[model samples]
Target: GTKYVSKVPDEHGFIEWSTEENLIWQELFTRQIACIKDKACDEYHEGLAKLNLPTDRIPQLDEVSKVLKVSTGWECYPVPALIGFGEFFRLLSEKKFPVATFIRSREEMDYLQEPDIFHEIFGHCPLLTNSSFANYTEAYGKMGLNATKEQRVFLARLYWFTIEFGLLDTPKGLRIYGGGVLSSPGETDYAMNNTDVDRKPFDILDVLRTPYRIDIMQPIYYMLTKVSDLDEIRKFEVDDIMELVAQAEALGLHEAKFPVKKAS
Candidate 1:
């Protein structure tokens, strides 16, 4: 599904990123910081500050992990640009984030369907520094480790809506907490400013029942009143989650809001 290969790290866990790669990181970092200043949640902003990422280079996974370990006992591990669901859940359960150590090419400056190093670190890692988000992620992973294939399909929706494309109805207005939206300039503006979308209060069942398309700008986003709402979710036992997943299954998926894909 992707042409780019993730750079492999050496013994010290360092990848020799080129000057061009660093420049891309600089460009992406600078532009996104400006775009997210008003639109990102305060929690995300605080974590971003703590990361203290370089404007000129892509930070090493270890450098990013240092902050995460102290802040939330989390760390990032470089993997292939893609991995299986079992590997993904296992990594998260162990508090390790899977980062594909690749940046988008110049042609993909605005968008890339695959999650790259810039997207993983810049978009998602900031929130992992916060305990509420981290705990919920760990819990989700633990649940996934034991879930049946049928159950995991339902579980993926929970991750998609809350962790990836989630929103917050902040008093400051609608602010982004989801790294998926935070990483892309187009999504940041569309998720916050677009009028032709559905933004509803966060509900676990509703989120689980919703369908999403990865390539399109989301037509729907579930909003939490606050970031701590994630912690509330973390408190739900595995049985509780499975129960909700069962309900979501019974009700079935809401019709996908994106246009149907033409047969390939």
Candidate 2:
């Protein structure tokens, strides 16, 4: 028999998570909850509560979709371990968030190369409830759908800074909204408190042109003046930013001050 192409299991109607799976979910959730309490942006924490994600087991697609639909008309879709870049952009453009079925083992808990269910559901779903964040994701998808391969190289950089490792400034202080930070306890703290890391103000051109590495801790983070800044980016003309991409390639990447490879 051919292995299923979908990253989600064949048994997809209702999630029949095993006891161990449920326990792992709870463990990951509890740990991250405590880790993100002070570090995560207030919007993320509040959104997590509003989403009311299941604590007992991995949430069924329908379960998450229910809240998402009401909140943002978004839905979660199960996909293969990795989908094509085009598919990823298309799904986001359609307001469908793709999720992988597999969960990382206890051994892989600290770091996993690929995004597991824990990372997808726990790390990202909370912020999806926020209208601006959700809009930003959709806008990115729209931008990417029309992008050429050359453009995608730059597009990925933008995604890296904003979606994967972005920060937000609240009335209180700088707080983390990036999925990369929200998912990992170590990254959450390192991004906020570390003196060596460089935190730059958000600039669309700089973000689209910036190069980043996935294998190591981020050496630099882009900080948004406010979460609403994402909404503004969505409204701005992308062509204006495309000119910056050309300028960036001409100027070349900034010196990697930290020990990390630039994304090729």
Candidate 3:
């Protein structure tokens, strides 16, 4: 297992992860698997089966790395609870996914501000197995790495809507691939079935300009026609997309029925 130092932990590694911790992982994993059966995107569900992730125990980083390496040339790297955005984008740019070694407490299983091991390994890793999603992530990282500081602020919104809380349109129906929604039981159900959520077709500029606050339930989500749509994003001239972002900013964001202040 690998680790790093940060506000949440030191370089030594996760403070400790015990049997009780593993049980929490198992409970969350099994429950969410059942919860997402029909609700999650078929790709996500199919990836779950393909990954053959361990249900009884939290998988070791080495185990996950081996599987991902074979599938997409991506590997899992352990990091502190939350790393800097630059570091994050850099890792993804290099096809190395970060895995936080920590696990959420039993009480906090349903909600946590930052991603834990389960959120990283279970929520995002499966999609990495898909070539299109993997390429999109890599492109996103490359984009982030090259973005100016001001551009990064707007760029972060692109990531929030797509990678953290994005949706997809499948033959079956609208389904989830966003790690933020997929990892949380509440958001996953609300994102998929809630009538209030506005599932707009994916427009890269619209996503970049969409103002979002992380603490509240998401009011708007972008839906891709298919996973392959993400790969197409890289083909568009980056400057052309930036122009759209500027236009969207001038026009401003859509009004949600319910909006909340940022969490302190």
Candidate 4:
């Protein structure tokens, strides 16, 4: 069995988390905080430290937005579970990342099919502390507003690979930079050490041409030489991106390396 909460804060922007809800946040944080050590990029950890996210309970949007606004001019907002692409981009364009307030229950602790509040905060909010990455996010949203449908899909792949499942080469070692991997304990360990996955250097064209399956362990991950690499992307001309997108389409996506589904 599983549980879901409305997570709707009243008009004043306050959420009433239940006792069990707080307990789940505690367990998720406890497990993930330990899991990410050495594995996550220093940039993410540095940001996480500023948020000072509560270890024993969920954090409020106001508190999180406060630090983000101060450091990177970014803020987190509440969305009803999931919103459409239009709203998703609009908020990001405004430098407000969406945070669905609800936390997933104990039933699906090992894995989740949706992005819960834990995933939003644990997976993403930390990175917002750093300017290069945060600025890149705002730029990505602005680009989305002008892109067509086909171009948007290609853009999403870039986002999926970088913002969601990207990696970084830190002074210490190869580290997880993407929220998708950082949010999940199993994926954090797997992305850093999985023998079967091909970790290639970050290539914007290649990233746009690659296909990914959300339900499976990623078969390939694009690695950045540094956390600052994202600044290169944020500064590119629109013609440069659309031309790259046009080129990736000409070559078609990389062959699907993983199976289609959880086959019997």
Candidate 5:
């Protein structure tokens, strides 16, 4: 596997990003801001405004964290390139969002397997200001903290469908809130304008049972028609969610959406 090493933070929890890295952040930021216009949901736009992110250089984690802390008691905690599920869950459970302390290289600018700093701050942090989204994320982290490995797989699907690739049907038009879609300019357009994909109505069980591939343009997406829809999911008791996971385990995954992975 290719390792995406992160820049180490100093004693004061600051990283020394390069001039080129700052340039990349500026380019990515300028391009994506245009791409997400009208395509992103109202909540996302509001959150993005609240963040008031810098356009020239990559914003510091503390800079992003201060905004989140005031809005939702969330903070961006720096981490290595990757961490285990336990650590990831524990951080979220504590209202700390883990941010990898590195930016993507120029060659891999458009798409990368692992999340880079731009993806974390620009892609996800803005939404941490949203109370519903924030509360739901915290609740999810709490559930995953005690969930079994098998159960966590199902929980991951929920996270993937909502936080990562979920869409919304708004009065303005179909809009996106998913970080995975918002982060990449290509995905921002495709998720909304593409006619080749299936945009299904929101269903918690369907989200759990659906299988997905990380490397391809999504063949399907789940949509939330109303704002309170997330409230319903957040209101689910941990045991009830576990029951849903159990049911999904028994029901089995849908057919594979992407071609099978090649052997290493």
Candidate 6:
């Protein structure tokens, strides 16, 4: 089993990663790059090419921040292993994305179910370069900052469906844009290639109304006509989203498309 966890940065916002951590980073890169070509959204590839993240070891958070600040005024805000919703949304609202310093060990490599360095940076940081994606992220963060605890649960699905596991139906074909799918090798193929899984067109109402379970492969995915569609969503007023959430609740949840989760 891999023994590495992400190293902590000093007060100056810098960290020194380990050899084992670097090796794991390389392993993740090799696994992701070989599988993602032609399957990922065009902007994701463009973002990755622009980032040119190191293959051997983890990249400095500031280096990634410099690129994002230049591209869309987005920055990477380093945090510990976990943070509460307030801090999470606050960072994003200010155009900062939290990069948890930890990396999943080799033993948990296939799916760690948490936002480790590899997932946050490798999966999400790339697309922050795109204006549409960046703007929407900033706006979502702003919206979440004012939401109540219960409302954030509804908002979480929006994050999951769009930012984490969303898809885009480009003219080329169905391509993945969501960071959650981006980082996972199994979901990378299954999200796009699985015939039995439901891939529906993006609908604000439908997305808000739908429910998702994190521990298993998703049975449904939301599709965008293009990545640019996020900009129009960015235009949505906070009240607009709030109203949609209420409507979704009123309409009730869509019946579970996959096997339901068991009680703990």
What TM-score does each of the candidates earn?
0.96, 0.91, 0.88, 0.95, 0.95, 0.95
Candidate 6: minimum summed lDDT over ten consecutive residues — where? 255-264
Give the TM-score (vs. native) of candidate 4.
0.95
The residue pairs found clashing in candidate 1 are: none
Q: What is the per-residue lDDT of model 4 for residues 84-198, given as tens digits with 9 covering 90 to 100? A: 8899888999998988788887779888877888898889999888999999999888888888899999989999999999998767789998998999988898998888788
Best by TM-score: 1
lDDT of 2 at 15: 50
Q: What does candidate 5's lDDT look like per residue over 108-211, in tens digits?
A: 88888888888888888888899989989998898898899998888888999999998998888899989999999889989989987989999999989888
Q: Clash number for every model?
A: 0, 2, 0, 0, 0, 0
C-alpha RMSD values across all candidates: 1.6, 3.1, 3.9, 1.9, 1.9, 1.8
lDDT of 1 by residue, 1-264 (tens): 349898988889989999999999999999999999899999999998989989899999999999999999999988997799999999999999999999999998988889999899999999899999999999989889999999998888889888888899988799999889999899999999999899999999888888777776677889998888998889999999999998888989877664523211
Q: What lDDT would each prediction earn against the true structure?
A: 0.90, 0.80, 0.79, 0.87, 0.87, 0.87
* TM-score between candidate 1 and the true structure: 0.96
Worst 10 residues of 2 by lDDT: 1-10
lDDT of 5 at 86: 97
lDDT of 6 at 61: 92
Off by over 4 Å in 6: 1-6, 261-264
Clashing pairs in 6: none
Tens digits of lDDT, candidate 3, 1-264: 223232233344334456897799889988998878777787777677768889978877767777788888999887776589889889999999987777776667778777788888889988888888888888878777767786777778888888889899888788888888888789888998889778999987767667778888788899997777888886656676566666767777655334744433
Deviating ranges (above 4 Å) for candidate 5: 258-264
Query: Which portions of model 1 show Cα errors greater than 4 Å?
Result: 258-264
